[PDB]
Design a protein around this ligand. Structure first.
Ligand SMILES: [Cl-]
Ligand SMILES: [Cl-]
Ligand SMILES: [Cl-]
Ligand SMILES: [Cl-]
Ligand SMILES: [Cl-]
Ligand SMILES: [Cl-]
Ligand SMILES: [Cl-]
Ligand SMILES: [Cl-]
Lengths: 141, 141
């Protein structure tokens, strides 16, 4: 499935990494041990988000109408996930906003296509996929 | 483990959801079926990120010095993950930037603590944890 089925937050992660001694201004591969760690951490944070969804689903199944406050733990974990995802991009010395803008361009464009009779989102004429490599090359040079 | 071990992107997701017919201005619980979907999608996108890390790790292990371009698929998947994470928060009608700011405050503050002899990050005096519930209540009211 897929989605169709003042400083920015990226800049905040740069501030954070400065604080913990952790980053490059241009795209730069990290040490293996650091990739490994990032992989684990993404793994863990996505697991916590999915667990909080499970709790809400169980409460809804029992018939509860959740309040705004009830959504806080999930919102907290989601933000934690943004943090470590932005963290990865910052660690890589990749401008997250530049890459995000290109991904957003392509997704928004795809959203403007027609739908199949069964409701599946189709691409519009002349749809242009996200060219993230082009963004990276641009940032590097 | 943990991290110690112009429109914003959140606003872009609101634009996207408008485009696909998908959102609330105040925190609002979603339908169960939609939570279920979001859970699956987070699951899948985090799996793809972790797979791209595996590929880079294998290349590094073989002795390669990765170029900036080599990082594009990982950067692309990371941005895809931001997209569906921001997507969740938007779906919930929760201002992602407000929640992120509070999580960032707490993380940056924790970073200012001393480290144990073994290098573990300790909290500073009077450290105040992220109060995401307070943010949610504020957004609701
Ligand atoms: Cl509900
Ligand atoms: Cl409440
Ligand atoms: Cl991080
Ligand atoms: Cl198509
Ligand atoms: Cl490398
Ligand atoms: Cl290259
Ligand atoms: Cl989404
Ligand atoms: Cl501590």
């Amino acid at each position: 499935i897929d989605p169709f089925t003042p400083p920015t937050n990226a800049e905040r992660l740069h501030e954070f990494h400065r604080a913990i001694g952790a980053t490059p201004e241009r795209p730069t591969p990290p040490p293996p041990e650091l990739l490994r760690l990032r992989q684990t951490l993404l793994d863990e944070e996505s697991a916590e988000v999915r667990a909080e969804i499970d709790h809400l689903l169980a409460r809804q199944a029992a018939g509860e109408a959740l309040s705004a406050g009830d959504l806080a733990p999930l919102a907290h974990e989601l933000a934690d996930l943004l943090y470590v995802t932005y963290g990865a991009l910052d660690q890589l010395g990749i401008d997250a906003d530049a890459v995000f803008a290109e991904v957003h361009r392509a997704n928004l464009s795809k959203a403007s296509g027609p739908r199949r009779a069964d409701g599946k989102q189709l691409k519009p004429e002349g749809w242009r996929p996200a060219d993230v490599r082009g963004v990276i090359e641009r940032l590097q040079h």
